[PDB]
């Protein structure tokens, strides 16, 4: 639960359930204008991913949360439209914050929103 | 062919198609403050309904468009969450020209958006 | 947090924040085919509503969660398109369950999903 | 006027309008496995982009459509969450005829859906 700075929440709109065991890769745009592996995980039984980074580690930058939606759907036996879902944003530019990226998935569609709260600094 | 100040567009998020043959019933709130039938139809092959009304019969007021989402997934043999999808809006043409009411459906969710324009 | 059977979560897509102090009215379709007041609330600072009903009270039926979106937007100074958001579903027909109705709001749009988990019975 | 096997539709959820003058850059994944520019344009007045390609140039493959969402809200002086919206899909016409890629935007969220059809 909020304490970490980057939390991801994935729901399944076909089943009306959390999207479980969904793979998520996080990237930081390097100095060279290339994406650099930052963190990864799988969502739990509640479709959340926590413990990705820490505050000292999560500096300002452009990150990409890539969610592997193709894999989750294939595995439930659907051939979905998308390759994956990718969310690109600028984090911590006017100070550190807490970020929640939620993705609501369906086979030919996905919505996605962000909740940003001010820790304090 | 006849001013369509009101249009509905329904789409299927599972299959990536228009949702066709969806029952849409529209209602005008009456002073007695109940709903009164107003226009009805089934979405075409492109998941659209048109010729619902005309600009003379469409006066300001509270309208409710109701989509029979449940029969839609049933026919597909997929178990739905909702009984139907509903949109309640105030039509205030003191500006507003055309109204497109779109809904994206999934077994457990639905989005809806309005496209209100002039041309 | 899950323990109650009907929980509502409302997010603001314009601000990227929980939709706070949002009024929610819950109805049960009577025997007579009329909606009967069932419960009401306001969402908290985290855009959730809990403690609406109890398990013994929430029998099978058709309920309507009506969210007063017009009021929240007006108050932030927008004239939104919708009158309110209303969610109609059949609850507890093949046994009791836990229901989470989330609504993601914008001025001319709203998405909404349901998470249903099996308590046990 | 020319087969448009690919179409993008952008809409604004704050204002209830098409999103016009949105930059859309499409890309074809190359074996070198990088993206290669493929088609580009700005949405019209109805928030649509067409004449992106033709059925001969559109072969199976991994495509990415990228929407410059951020400049869009900027021009409106509303602070955005995302740098842009992206859709990666495999175009496998061994069936598929037309592709409509729609995106509904808000300052902190976006939905996207695909409408894949035959007619
Ligand atoms: C009128 C039209 O262009 N018909 C198109 C497809 C289409 C694009 C966007 C849209 O609107 C819309 C899009 C999304 N979305 O995610 O892209 C969405 O979530 C909603 N919605 O929730 O109501 C509506 C509705 C329909 C077709 O050729 O079938
Ligand atoms: C559990 C949790 O993370 N709480 C978060 C916010 C949050 C994320 C996703 C979500 O689900 C959701 C997401 C979308 N979406 O588009 O991303 C959506 O459209 C809907 N919806 O329509 O109900 C729900 C609901 C709520 C918080 O910090 O309070």
DSSP state at residue C73: H
Nearest-angstrom CA–CA distance, B52 and B40: 7
Binary contact (D113, B16; C-beta < 8 A): yes
- Substitution target from D10, D16, D108 for chain C, most C beta carbons within 10 A: D108
All partners of chain B with 3 or more CB pairs under 8 angstroms: A, C, D
Using CB atoms within 10 Å of the CB of residue B44, give its burial: 0 to 12 exposed, 13 to 18 middle, 19+ buried: middle
Break chain D down into helix, strand, coil percent, rounded to 5.
5, 50, 45
How many other C-beta atoms can be found within 10 angstroms of the C-beta atom of residue A119? 12
User: What does the block give as tokens for B114?
Assistant: 């309005």
How many other C-beta atoms can be found within 10 angstroms of the C-beta atom of residue D113? 25
Selection from D12, D64, D87 nearest residue A110 by Cα: D87
CATH number, domain with residue B91:
2.60.40.180
Residues B93 and B117: beta-carbon distance below 8 Å:
no
Nearest-angstrom CA–CA distance, A118 and C85: 29
- Substitution target from A11, A15, A16 for chain B, most B beta carbons within 10 A: A16
Three-state DSSP class for residue C19: coil
Nearest-angstrom CA–CA distance, C5 and A107: 28
- β-strand pairing of D98-106 with D6-12: parallel
Q: Give the method of determination.
A: X-ray
Residues C84 and C110: beta-carbon distance below 8 Å:
no
Tokens 């369906």 identify what position? A106
Q: How far apart are the first and last CA of chain D?
A: 15
DSSP state at residue D43: -
Nearest-angstrom CA–CA distance, B106 and A92: 35
Selection from D17, D20, D16 nearest residue D8 by Cα: D20
Binary contact (A86, D84; C-beta < 8 A): no
Nearest-angstrom CA–CA distance, D94 and D111: 27
Residues A67 and A15: beta-carbon distance below 8 Å:
no
All partners of chain A with 3 or more CB pairs under 8 angstroms: B, C, D
Q: Find the Cα–Cα–Cα–Cα dihedral D33, D110, C15, A14, rounded to 10°.
A: -110
How many other C-beta atoms can be found within 10 angstroms of the C-beta atom of residue B74? 12
| Total count of residues recorded for chain A | 121
- β-strand pairing of B23-29 with B61-67: antiparallel
Residues D107 and C15: beta-carbon distance below 8 Å:
yes
Domain count, chain B: 1
Q: How far apart are the first and last CA of chain A?
A: 19
Residue of A nearest to B104 (CA): A109
**Cβ of A100 less than 6 Å from ligand 2:** yes
User: What does the block give as tokens for B45?
Assistant: 């092959």
Residues A24 and A49: beta-carbon distance below 8 Å:
yes
DSSP state at residue C72: H
- Spell out a b/e string for C48-87, using b for 16 or more CB atoms within 10 Å of the CB, else e: bbbebbeeeebeebbbbbbbbbbebbeeeebebbbbbbbb
Q: Does A104 reach chain B within 8 Å, measured CB to CB?
A: yes
DSSP B62-100: EEEEEE-HHHHHHTTT---SEEEEEEEEEE--SS--EEE
Nearest-angstrom CA–CA distance, C19 and C73: 10
User: Residue A78 to residues A44, C42, C51, C99: CA-CA distances in angstroms?
Assistant: 21, 39, 37, 26
Residues C24 and C67: beta-carbon distance below 8 Å:
yes
Chain D residues with CB-CB distance to C106 below 8 A: 13-14, 106, 109
- Spell out a b/e string for B91-118, using b for 16 or more CB atoms within 10 Å of the CB, else e: beeeebebbbbbbbbbbbbbbbbbbbee
Q: Which residue's alpha carbon is at the smallest distance from atom 22 of ligand 1?
A: B111
Resolution number, Å = 2.2
Its domain, for residue D42, covers 1-119
Nearest-angstrom CA–CA distance, D116 and D119: 10
CA angle at C117 for the pair C115 and C118, rounded to the nearest 5°: 160
Nearest-angstrom CA–CA distance, C18 and D6: 36
Nearest-angstrom CA–CA distance, C47 and C23: 11
Q: Does D45 reach chain C within 8 Å, measured CB to CB?
A: no
CA angle at C54 for the pair C52 and C60, rounded to the nearest 5°: 100
User: What does the block give as tokens for C108?
Assistant: 């001319």
Residues B38 and B62: beta-carbon distance below 8 Å:
no
Who contacts A63 (Cβ-Cβ below 8 Å, separation ≥6)? A6, A26, A27, A28, A29, A38, A88, A89, A91
User: What does the block give as tokens for B106?
Assistant: 């999934």
DSSP A16-61: TEE--S-EEEEEEE-TTS-EEEEEEEE--TTSEE--S--TTT--SE
User: Residue D66 to residues A20, B107, C73, D8, D97: CA-CA distances in angstroms?
Assistant: 28, 28, 30, 10, 21
User: What does the block give as tokens for C89?
Assistant: 């579903």
Binary contact (A14, B106; C-beta < 8 A): yes
């Amino acid at each position: 639960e909020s304490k970490c700075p980057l939390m991801v929440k994935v729901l399944d709109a076909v089943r009306g359930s959390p999207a479980i065991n969904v793979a998520v890769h996080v990237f930081r745009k390097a100095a060279d204008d290339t994406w650099e592996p930052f963190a990864s995980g799988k969502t739990s039984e509640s479709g959340e991913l926590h413990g990705l980074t820490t505050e000292e580690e999560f500096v300002e930058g452009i990150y990409k949360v890539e969610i592997d939606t193709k894999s989750y759907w294939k595995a439930l036996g659907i051939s979905p439209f998308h390759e994956h879902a990718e969310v690109v944003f600028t984090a911590n530019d006017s100070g550190p914050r807490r970020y929640t990226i939620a993705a609501l998935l369906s086979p030919y569609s996905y919505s996605t929103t962000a909740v940003v709260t001010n820790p304090k600094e």
